[PDB]
Amino acid sequence: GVTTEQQHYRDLMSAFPTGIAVVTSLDAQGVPRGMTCSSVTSATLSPPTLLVCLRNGSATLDAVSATRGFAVNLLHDGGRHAAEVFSGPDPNRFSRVQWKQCRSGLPWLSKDAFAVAECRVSGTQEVGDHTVVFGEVARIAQTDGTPLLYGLRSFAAWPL
Amino acid sequence: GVTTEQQHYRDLMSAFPTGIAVVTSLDAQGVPRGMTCSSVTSATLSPPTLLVCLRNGSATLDAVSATRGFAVNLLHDGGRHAAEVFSGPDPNRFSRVQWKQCRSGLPWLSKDAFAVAECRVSGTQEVGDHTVVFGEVARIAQTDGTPLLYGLRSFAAWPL
Ligand SMILES: Cc1cc2nc3c(=O)[nH]c(=O)nc-3n(C[C@H](O)[C@H](O)[C@H](O)COP(=O)(O)OP(=O)(O)OC[C@H]3O[C@@H](n4cnc5c(N)ncnc54)[C@H](O)[C@@H]3O)c2cc1C
Ligand SMILES: Cc1cc2nc3c(=O)[nH]c(=O)nc-3n(C[C@H](O)[C@H](O)[C@H](O)COP(=O)(O)OP(=O)(O)OC[C@H]3O[C@@H](n4cnc5c(N)ncnc54)[C@H](O)[C@@H]3O)c2cc1C
Ligand SMILES: Cc1cc2nc3c(=O)[nH]c(=O)nc-3n(C[C@H](O)[C@H](O)[C@H](O)COP(=O)(O)OP(=O)(O)OC[C@H]3O[C@@H](n4cnc5c(N)ncnc54)[C@H](O)[C@@H]3O)c2cc1C
Ligand SMILES: Cc1cc2nc3c(=O)[nH]c(=O)nc-3n(C[C@H](O)[C@H](O)[C@H](O)COP(=O)(O)OP(=O)(O)OC[C@H]3O[C@@H](n4cnc5c(N)ncnc54)[C@H](O)[C@@H]3O)c2cc1C
């Protein structure tokens, strides 16, 4: 029954660095929604499926649920400003980055991302106040780029 | 082997770098098992819950499923050899690293890890030929260290 304290858990997870995505979708009104997301994780190749973990009540999760699809925009190492915009309190985040619609309508961050994966929601699992969203990847557009990172409470860039 | 569609997905996920864990457990017969794992992700803070995604039929998933506990060993930048051992074909991996048994029985990679988190399995979800394993974190030990990273088909060190 023993359970670690929340702060010790944050200190642990802060020491597992990751890339950074902006996960996007459309709300029921057709308005683009999205957030900075470091919980992008590969699940399986058969068929290609990733997952993300989104806060319950977030605008992005609501949009993902309404559209049943989402785009994962992997940020290159020039993308820190986008990652800040998409994790902070600013209104109208899509007015502050360049973006375009995918053929599906999903928002693509065309200047700040080096890759965009369009996903269909294939399932969800609530865990506490979050939801794990499974995304079956439908289409990928990918260019050369050096990934942005986040870890130990800082932004960095892939070093190689 | 992989299909063309799976290869494009691999190319995408390769470009999302991460830290590196070795996920360990004991199998039903008490033998240590483990694997190199980059799928560590945070699920929720209340209670502290992470997830990992493990291949179905792997020795490590069999052990985790049988005993319902596992340790997440986060590797420092001196831990590349352990990451290679725990992802390679040789099942004799625990004779190739220095390790210690926790009080609970879980294997701790004492020389190669800067943090260890002991987890109880709180749920699972099969996805294709993998299983997402939710771990409620029971205990963490952590020291300063530079995380090992993997991305773009290479190991690297967190750059600070
Ligand atoms: C590196 C990093 C990684 C992250 N990874 C994840 C992850 O994997 N999963 C996750 O759930 N979260 C994650 N976050 C947090 C997430 O980016 C923010 O919570 C984001 O604001 C969520 O946006 P939203 O529009 O979906 O949600 P909402 O919180 O519903 O915000 C709606 C809108 O209100 C505004 N707003 C934003 N924050 C606030 C606020 N505090 N108060 C008032 N208005 C606000 C913005 O315009 C926002 O678009 C991460 C943050 C960082 C920095
Ligand atoms: C999966 C995930 C979910 C998030 N959910 C929210 C949320 O519900 N509301 C919000 O305002 N911001 C949320 N965020 C943003 C988060 O609280 C931090 O602001 C952001 O992750 C940057 O924190 P840090 O690493 O600098 O430091 P810390 O705040 O010390 O976080 C360290 C690590 O702890 C984990 N973590 C932190 N907060 C949460 C959380 N609330 N739920 C799950 N894991 C967490 C993440 O892995 C994070 O990288 C979330 C981030 C992630 C990655
Ligand atoms: C979630 C996950 C599951 C894995 N499952 C297996 C497995 O069942 N059998 C095996 O022999 N090795 C598996 N591996 C190891 C994997 O095949 C690669 O050898 C390892 O991730 C390093 O690959 P790479 O990044 O150098 O290049 P690549 O082989 O090009 O892989 C690139 C990325 O694709 C993703 N990926 C690759 N293979 C898989 C897979 N099978 N399932 C889900 N995502 C995958 C990972 O995110 C990986 O980093 C898995 C890795 C991960 C992260
Ligand atoms: C950077 C990186 C990240 C990765 N991330 C992931 C991830 O997140 N998820 C994932 O699933 N994989 C991941 N992998 C792949 C994973 O580390 C390897 O597939 C690993 O070898 C699995 O180990 P295992 O002992 O659990 O599995 P197994 O594949 O069962 O066994 C490994 C080897 O031992 C043999 N063996 C197993 N059991 C026995 C036994 N009882 N007696 C004799 N021989 C036996 C097998 O035949 C095989 O040769 C990753 C790899 C890399 C390089």
A124 among annotated binding-site residues: no
d(CA A48, CA A70): 15
DSSP state of A46: T
Q: Which of A26, A72, A77 lies closest to A53 in space, CA to CA? A: A72
Question: Is the omega angle on the peptide bond into residue B47 within 30 degrees of 0, that is, cis?
Answer: yes
Contact B117, B50 (CB under 8 A): yes
> Token digits for B49?
């819950």
Ramachandran angles phi, psi of B140, nearest 5°: -125, 140
Ligand 1, atom 39: closest residue by C-alpha: A89
Residue A130 distance to chain B (closest CA, Å): 6
- Among A43, A74, A147, beta carbon nearest to B130: A43
Distances (CA, A) of B94 to A89, B81, B82, B85, B109: 48, 12, 9, 9, 9
Q: Which of B87, B131, B140 lies closest to A125 in space, CA to CA? A: B131
Q: Which of B28, B34, B29 lies closest to B92 in space, CA to CA? A: B34
> Token digits for B158?
């967190």
d(CA A148, CA B16): 9
Q: If 0-12 CB within 10 Å is exposed, 13-18 middle and 19+ buried, where does residue B130 land?
A: buried
Classified as helix, coil or strand, A30 is coil
Cβ-based contacts of B151 with chain A (< 8 Å):
19, 147, 158
Q: Which of A66, A60, A80, A72 lies closest to A116 in space, CA to CA? A: A72
Ramachandran angles phi, psi of A140, nearest 5°: -135, 135
d(CA A21, CA A149): 10
Q: Is B51 in the pocket of ligand 4 (CB under 6 A)?
A: no
Q: Which of A98, A94, A101, A102 lies closest to A112 in space, CA to CA? A: A98
Chain A, nearest residue to B74 by Cα: A16
How many residues can be counted in chain A? 160
CB pairs under 8 A between A and B: 185
Distance A100 CA to ligand 3 centre (A): 31
Ramachandran angles phi, psi of A144, nearest 5°: -65, 145
| Architecture of the domain spanning A6-152 | Roll (2.30)
Distance A32 CA to ligand 3 centre (A): 32
Classified as helix, coil or strand, A133 is strand
d(CA B15, CA A98): 22
3-state SS of chain B is CCCHHHHHHHHHHHCCCEECEEEEEECCCCCEEEEEECCCEEEECCCCEEEEEEECCCHHHHHHHHHCEEEEEEEECCCHHHHHHCCCCCCCHHHCCCCEECCCCCEECCCCEEEEEEEEEEEEEEECCEEEEEEEEEEEEECCCCEEEEECCEEEECCC
In one-letter notation, the amino acid at residue A16 is F
Q: What is the resolution of this structure in A?
A: 1.1
d(CA B86, CA A9): 24
CATH number corresponding to B4-148: 2.30.110.10
Q: How many CB atoms lie within 10 A of CB B88?
A: 12
Q: Is A84 in the pocket of ligand 1 (CB under 6 A)?
A: no
Ligand 2 site residues (CB inside 6 A) read: A 10, 13-14, 38-39, 53, 55, 153; B 42, 44-45
Q: Which of B115, B135, B105, B111 lies closest to B123 in space, CA to CA? A: B135
Ligand 1, atom 29: closest residue by C-alpha: A58
How many residues can be counted in chain B? 160
Ligand nearest to the CA of A156: 1
Contacts of B103 (CB under 8 A, 6+ apart): none
> Token digits for B2?
């992989």
Q: Which residue shows structure tokens 């058969």?
A: A46
Contacts of B44 (CB under 8 A, 6+ apart): A53, A127, A128, A129, A130
Contact B143, B113 (CB under 8 A): no
To which H or E segment does residue A13 belong?
Answer: helix A6-14
Distances (CA, A) of A112 to A21, A51, A92, A141: 10, 21, 17, 13
DSSP state of A54: E
Interface mutation target, options A41, A124, A155, chain B, most CBs of B under 10 Å: A41
Q: ∠B41-B47-B48 over CA atoms, to 5°?
A: 30
